[PDB]
Design a protein around this ligand. Structure first.
Ligand SMILES: [Zn+2]
Ligand SMILES: [Zn+2]
Ligand SMILES: [Zn+2]
Ligand SMILES: [Zn+2]
Lengths: 199, 199, 199, 199
């Protein structure tokens, strides 16, 4: 992709936001990977929308890309696990443990064991290391603080956290400039689909 | 929204497709509601991606908007129900029946009863009216044929089924026209974010 | 089985009751089929122990033995079904409907349909015929009244509802009589396993 | 209970067996606790009827009565757990782990952890200590061999493993002796419920 084409994506991101095509905005952010929307990410973490959180992240990094990315996915999936335990859904917890968390076992065998053993407690706060889990809301906020620091320090997000400053409706402005150009060819002085003409 | 702004969405739809931002394309189709992609819809129906099918439809119509829309959602949810029965998941079938299909009971009480009673059969092909359900693949294709006819006849889709014919990369062309205009102001004759200048 | 052997079972039923071998009592009642314990049956119905209720009944009658027996099992399984609905366990309800209640469909097609359709209600008291279901406790008591009348009128229970009047510990008394007989052979005048002897 | 009354139970156990009241036999064995039927226990272990196995055992010992009893229940519940894993029912396995196996954690913390961690394997034979689990049939037979040795060495089963040798139908014989005694009072020389008389 050209630098031109990349900039055009940013102009479109701005346009879509101004037109309040909100889901389209975040899909384009994700598929192009040119811009990671922190506020959007924070929103989804607070709402516990873990599926969308990972889907969004997937446009920017894989779990094993580097150590920051690994800890990011580990923290998210671990919170997902603990929340399952908290609602007494041990069936879901084990599912999460095997499908989402097992990839981390290689990197730290004994931590995975420690986390596995939480399954068998009446309340996993009986483990002193997990006695710090307060409620869902507070534990998400605490974790989010850590997630932000990991993302901001993650080299794969290096130039993707600040939106280019531009004047409002920059795309619309360029379009109007093209219309003026189309007219600056016409003697004797419609649509965007085909050029404007005069006799 | 202006006719200008609407046309700009179409230019963006073309650009996104050319850049192979496929999910963004269909999200913009859905959120703007300006264009319904039949081929995309066919693909998702054949794949049995019922959640995405309804989500996509939701940008164009509600279940109770008119009779065509009602039959469209009824046919989709009924196929979803029958497929649940076919894999012997009666728990899921009842869920579908109560959550997705019950809204249709008012409009036809006895058909809903008929469909409900399929739950109790060893094989719902024991009902002669449903003896026509062959396998999943063939039943999806048959239904799709009907879905297309309902959509094409649905007044809410009237001008949304044919993409405007335009030359490739129309957005990119307008952008280049703006660049030429920015230069047609410069004595003595960079970026898209701010205007190009010469001394 | 002889009339002797049958009477011996009754003597054993009395002994087991006196020794408070309560589960053994009801197992012997069931396996021999000589006596149906109404009070025990009432207890299990009030407690909603449907599995044991049917197991106990199974020693005395099959579901299709006659019309009384059929209505007895129908009423029990229908209550089991309604209770599942009441606790919002539609998965269990459908299971009951297909496994336990379907055998009754042949005998009354439209009643089974009526009962099936209760699945789809938010509250099955929306059906006027089932608007009479109050709470679990009261509905069990009402049904029990009907179950008793069906059992008492059921020809297969004809001579099995009243325990033979006998003096307490009749078995123990006969045993002591045998011991006296064993001694009424001994010059010159231990265990039950072998005869008592004197030199 | 007298030694008389205890012997009478054995006479009844014999009678019930001779009359093929099989479930009553094992219920009386269990409730009286006077005799533990090894062959019956073997049968139920081979059939994997774990609920009935524990119910039967419950008449003779509690899990924490002594070390033999503890190992007996541990081995049974562990096999139940492994079988759940084998059929890929991790939901059931966790249930067993928390409800049935947790009581053993106090006595051996690290073995319980080891067993817990089997949940997360694709195949729990990946653990070298559990690489010995062959198939269900063979693992039940192996375990049964150990269960027998534990039961035979368990002081609570000391005099409960061998049935008293007696002649067939000993109860029936004593009954006939009582009938003869009832007649050895009659000038001038029916039922078991009341004494036999002549004018
Ligand atoms: Zn012009
Ligand atoms: Zn210039
Ligand atoms: Zn004597
Ligand atoms: Zn006599």
């Amino acid at each position: 992709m050209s630098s031109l084409s990349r900039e055009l994506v940013f102009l479109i991101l701005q346009f879509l936001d101004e037109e309040k095509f909100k889901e389209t905005v975040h899909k384009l952010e994700q598929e192009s990977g040119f811009f990671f929307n922190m506020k959007y990410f924070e929103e989804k973490v607070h709402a516990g929308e873990w599926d969308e959180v990972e889907k969004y992240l997937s446009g920017f990094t894989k779990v094993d890309d580097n150590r920051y990315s690994m800890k990011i996915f580990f923290e998210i999936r671990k919170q997902k696990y603990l929340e399952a335990l908290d609602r007494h859904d041990r069936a879901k917890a084990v599912d999460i443990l095997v499908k989402d968390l097992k990839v981390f076992s290689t990197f730290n065998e004994e931590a995975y064991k420690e986390i596995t053993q939480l399954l068998t407690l009446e309340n996993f706060r009986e483990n002193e290391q997990a006695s710090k889990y307060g409620d869902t809301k507070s534990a998400r906020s605490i974790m989010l603080i850590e997630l932000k620091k990991l993302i901001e320090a993650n080299p794969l997000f290096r130039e993707k956290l600040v939106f280019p400053t531009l004047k409002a409706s920059r795309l619309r402005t360029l379009i109007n400039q093209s219309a003026n150009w189309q007219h600056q060819l016409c003697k004797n002085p419609k649509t965007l689909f085909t050029d404007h003409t005069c006799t």
